[PDB]
Structure 1
Amino acid sequence: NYVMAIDQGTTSSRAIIFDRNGKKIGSSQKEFPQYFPKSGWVEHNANEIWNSVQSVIAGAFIESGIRPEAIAGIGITNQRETTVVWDKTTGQPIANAIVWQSRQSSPIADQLKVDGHTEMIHEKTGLVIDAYFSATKVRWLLDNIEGAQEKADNGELLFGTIDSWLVWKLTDGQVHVTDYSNASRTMLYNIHKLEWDQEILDLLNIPSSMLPEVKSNSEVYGHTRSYAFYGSEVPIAGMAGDQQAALFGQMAFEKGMIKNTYGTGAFIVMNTGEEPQLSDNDLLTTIGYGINGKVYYALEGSIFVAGSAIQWLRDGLRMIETSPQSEELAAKAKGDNEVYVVPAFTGLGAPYWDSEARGAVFGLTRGTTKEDFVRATLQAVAYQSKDVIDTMKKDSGIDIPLLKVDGGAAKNDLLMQFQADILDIDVQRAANLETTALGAAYLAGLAVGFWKDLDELKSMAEEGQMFTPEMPAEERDNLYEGWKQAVAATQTFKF
């Protein structure tokens, strides 16, 4: 009667039990520790990630009353790029996972750019050389953890993005698999030919004995053998990197269809059908998902720092008491809107890909208030999303009249209205802001035949909220122009 989704996020994990109608019948959420050993580094402990996941599985069962034997399948979805390396026999990570947020491995990406590898790597993976992606993280771990390169060389070490790490734990070590969307983010996988790339692996000295089998996004990978499911061998049947799962949960199945998820980072992903579309040094060409013997590619713009800028306001400046306070403060801003925050703490993501940029603020006067400051900080995401979406218009030739939206931070009505005004395009927000987890559930539920099809269409389609652009061209243009100026000035600070 139900499908469980596990959504293993950057700051928290969640498990959600959905029924045949696509409705939430049970759920549990648990934060886990974030580690910053040096500025610019972000790590997680993959065991503490795994316990967070055990906790929410058990929690969703405990609170709902539902037991494992009622679950038709499990979908898994996850913060992408984040890299685990673990000993195959003891199942222990050789060190902390390194988060997609981290830039600890940036020297290794810099050297790759120095040695001339840009276009080769972009033509195989669709990606920009950067420490965002898993390849340099696996190289970092092989360079810096004593003994590890030799073990990997001896076949004793496994690599996994978090999806892979989860299925391995959930099967108690039986299955080492990743799906095409997560593999496409490692910068080790050739997204054209659909295989791990030997040349990139030899170049970074990564033995291929580390690597999981890659499979589609909707098939039974294996069955649980695990405490919180115990005794049921529940099929693990749906897997996608979170931003692709969101793309899926949006039903963005046709070429051109685009969503943005507003969370710790924000990720604009457009389905480009069964063929990949050309790059530049601006968007990423990536894999949406593989299902029904077909692979759908996607174009993506990545905005690394979005809701985590709010967390900085809370934690770093202590300007706000909690993160929900940002929305109240910002609603109360009285300034002309001439302050701009460009919270690019770790570098600017799409369409700039400038790793050396850091966060900056512009247009401050003696009248600037806490409220003005918080609002500017929120609006950065909507402006950079425009940067992205206009680039995708240019790169796609595809005019875009509808942006679908989801993610915890999409709950802010004024932000969503600003986003539509600034874009001059309609913005439709999902009823259930966790379409990430729904997308994983849909993939799992199709695999095990809980749902027969994609055209069990928007059968289920509860969702609505439409934000229609109501800002005149003049205002919208002056706003965006100040943003572009702020970004160009941010880029000139290269100390």
Structure 2
Amino acid sequence: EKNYVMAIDQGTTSSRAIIFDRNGKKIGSSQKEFPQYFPKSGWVEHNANEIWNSVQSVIAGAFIESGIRPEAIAGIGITNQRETTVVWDKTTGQPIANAIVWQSRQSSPIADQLKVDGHTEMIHEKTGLVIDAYFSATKVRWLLDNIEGAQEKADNGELLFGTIDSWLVWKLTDGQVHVTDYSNASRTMLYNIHKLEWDQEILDLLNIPSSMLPEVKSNSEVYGHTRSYEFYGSEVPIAGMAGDQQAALFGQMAFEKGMIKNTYGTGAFIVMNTGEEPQLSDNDLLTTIGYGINGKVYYALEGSIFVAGSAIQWLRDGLRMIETSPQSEELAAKAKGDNEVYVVPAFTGLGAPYWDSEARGAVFGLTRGTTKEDFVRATLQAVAYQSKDVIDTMKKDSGIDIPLLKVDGGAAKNDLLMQFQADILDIDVQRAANLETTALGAAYLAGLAVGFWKDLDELKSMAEEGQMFTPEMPAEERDNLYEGWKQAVAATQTFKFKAK
């Protein structure tokens, strides 16, 4: 236990591990994709054993690339795709079925039914969330409805539930620790964010035995130590944990009320720190927990954009319009049209501020002159436009003006996209020097827990700001582009055809 901390980032389509020194500098890293299953249209599943294997792989890869040995690791921090739900057998460690991903709509019939039975308001008051298949609760209900015998095993204390943080810590401790942090728990829709406890009324409503549930802890404390007889001959403290979007918020050093970031990945998620009190007005956004450290709980407002990077995957894999995902920026830069085509890629419904689960993907403004380049450019721009919807909502809700947006994520590497984002927002966009701020955030949490870094000030002193994009598009051009987006979304929301 010495001079390095490791972060593991278990993302939607790949896992990553990174080892940092006491300066916050990257010494080694490794990344590996894992299988995505789509058994029925709208369903998305992961095999949790394959997720664990990808994590084992990248932990190995980080050590191999760094030349660092486990005995030198002070702490491990863990961050993850949120909501994605695993249920597993307590004795064998075997998942009962595939994990259901946050992307999946397979549990929508159950969410719909909860709405028809009138629970929307109660759920929102307790959890800060909205009744939707997005969150863990209906994924658990789905698994206990559909996996033969699962409900009875659960009623007999034999099955455990966990989000990915919890699953991984379980794996790493070989079953000794079944824990989750406040930020991940807050995403389950089973957790009361005001009383800070699993909500018994929701549990009863859904017939989920409380014996399935992990204990909830802060985002920065020692949860246990590795056994994992792959982590070599070392018992390393598992010491920081947060949902990926909250990890990014922390890694961006957004510690003060009002500070705001956006992470561009498979989806895009705008999170504002609101401090120790939720927020007077939640309208059209989620109220969630940012992080719990130093005895205190810090809340956040979040607007979720479900489909961002995955729209580009669709172009590649569905339409086969592009050969690779990076090729998309090459094509978009070459677009020659008037910029009047709009793609609203709401494959699973519109996220914030709309939260309209019946919307599907749509395209507008097509003409004979519309080229592949134009269509790909419009697809990329969607995430910038919806980010503005969200950020305007955040100003309205928070009554705070927003002079600056910090940004991170794989997709934020696209300079032209970031310039466009600044241009349409008419606010400065500050891109992180190290785009993987999710992993950095988890490393910070773990480092603070073990005394690797002592104080939030030692973290600040590591801050080395990145590329700044300043707005350079005139008000008339910007107002026109955004007004066309609003009309596109409006028109998308009018298509609500349901068969029979």
Q: TM-score, length-normalised on structure 2?
A: 0.98
Q: Could you tell which deviates more after superposition, 157-166 or 277-286? A: 277-286
1:348-389 Cα deviation digits (max 9, x unpaired):
000000011010000000110111100000000000000000
Look up the match of 1:16. 18
Cα pair distance change 1:190/1:97, threshold 3 Å: same
Deviation at 1:463, TM superposition (A): 2.7
1:291-346 Cα deviation digits (max 9, x unpaired):
01010000000000000000111111111110100111101111110000000001
Deviation at 1:279, TM superposition (A): 5.2
Moved over 3 A (4+): 278-281
1:190-232 Cα deviation digits (max 9, x unpaired):
0001000000000000000000000000000000001331211
Deviation at 1:277, TM superposition (A): 1.4
**Which of the numbers 471, 494, 497 marks the counterpart of 1:492?**
494
CA contact (8 A) 1:57 1:228 kept: no
1:130-151 Cα deviation digits (max 9, x unpaired):
0000000000000000000000
Deviation at 1:461, TM superposition (A): 1.8
CA contact (8 A) 1:79 1:242 kept: yes
What is the aligned-residue RMSD (CA, Å)?
0.7
Identity %: 100
**Distance (whole Å) between structure 2 residues aligned to residue 156 and residue 11 of structure 1:** 30
1:415-441 Cα deviation digits (max 9, x unpaired):
001001101111000000000000000
Cα pair distance change 1:261/1:279, threshold 3 Å: same
Look up the match of 2:395. 393
**Distance (whole Å) between structure 1 residues aligned to residue 379 and residue 229 of structure 2:** 43
1:70-108 Cα deviation digits (max 9, x unpaired):
000000000000000000000000000000000000010
Q: Please give the secondary structure, in 1, of the residue aligned with 2:297.
A: strand
CA contact (8 A) 1:128 1:281 kept: no
Q: Could you tell which deviates more after superposition, 222-231 or 171-180? A: 222-231
1:300 aligns with 2:313: no
Q: Could you tell which deviates more after superposition, 58-67 or 126-135? A: 58-67
CA contact (8 A) 1:405 1:429 kept: yes
**Distance (whole Å) between structure 1 residues aligned to residue 294 and residue 389 of structure 2:** 34
Structure 2 alignment gaps of length 5 or more? none
Q: Could you tell which deviates more after superposition, 112-121 or 459-468? A: 459-468
1:438 aligns with 2:440: yes
**Which of the numbers 83, 96, 101 marks the counterpart of 1:81?**
83
Deviation at 1:457, TM superposition (A): 4.1
Q: Please give the secondary structure, in 2, of the residue aligned with 1:227.
A: coil
CA contact (8 A) 1:278 1:285 kept: no
Cα pair distance change 1:281/1:399, threshold 3 Å: closer
**Distance (whole Å) between structure 2 residues aligned to residue 278 and residue 350 of structure 1:** 18
Q: Please give the secondary structure, in 2, of the residue aligned with 1:409.
A: helix
Q: Please give the secondary structure, in 2, of the residue aligned with 1:289.
A: strand
1:55 aligns with 2:57: yes
**Distance (whole Å) between structure 2 residues aligned to residue 83 and residue 464 of structure 1:** 35
Q: Please give the secondary structure, in 2, of the residue aligned with 1:476.
A: helix
CA contact (8 A) 2:283 2:397 kept: no
Deviation at 1:468, TM superposition (A): 0.5
**Which of the numbers 272, 275, 280 marks the counterpart of 2:274?**
272
1:354 aligns with 2:356: yes
Look up the match of 1:40. 42
CA contact (8 A) 1:108 1:136 kept: yes
1:18-60 Cα deviation digits (max 9, x unpaired):
0110011000111000000000000000000000000000111
**Distance (whole Å) between structure 1 residues aligned to residue 22 and residue 5 of structure 2:** 8
**Distance (whole Å) between structure 2 residues aligned to residue 294 and residue 87 of structure 1:** 34
**Distance (whole Å) between structure 1 residues aligned to residue 156 and residue 371 of structure 2:** 59
**Distance (whole Å) between structure 2 residues aligned to residue 475 and residue 162 of structure 1:** 43
**Distance (whole Å) between structure 1 residues aligned to residue 12 and residue 280 of structure 2:** 29
**Distance (whole Å) between structure 2 residues aligned to residue 224 and residue 98 of structure 1:** 26
Cα pair distance change 1:298/1:390, threshold 3 Å: same
**Distance (whole Å) between structure 1 residues aligned to residue 145 and residue 166 of structure 2:** 22
1:235-264 Cα deviation digits (max 9, x unpaired):
000000000000000000000000000000
Q: Please give the secondary structure, in 2, of the residue aligned with 1:132.
A: coil
**Distance (whole Å) between structure 2 residues aligned to residue 422 and residue 475 of structure 1:** 9
Cα pair distance change 1:209/1:279, threshold 3 Å: farther
Q: Please give the secondary structure, in 1, of the residue aligned with 2:318.
A: helix
**Distance (whole Å) between structure 1 residues aligned to residue 435 and residue 92 of structure 2:** 38
Deviation at 1:462, TM superposition (A): 2.3
CA contact (8 A) 2:282 2:301 kept: no
Q: TM-score, length-normalised on structure 1?
A: 0.99
Deviation at 1:64, TM superposition (A): 1.2
Residue correspondences, number = 495
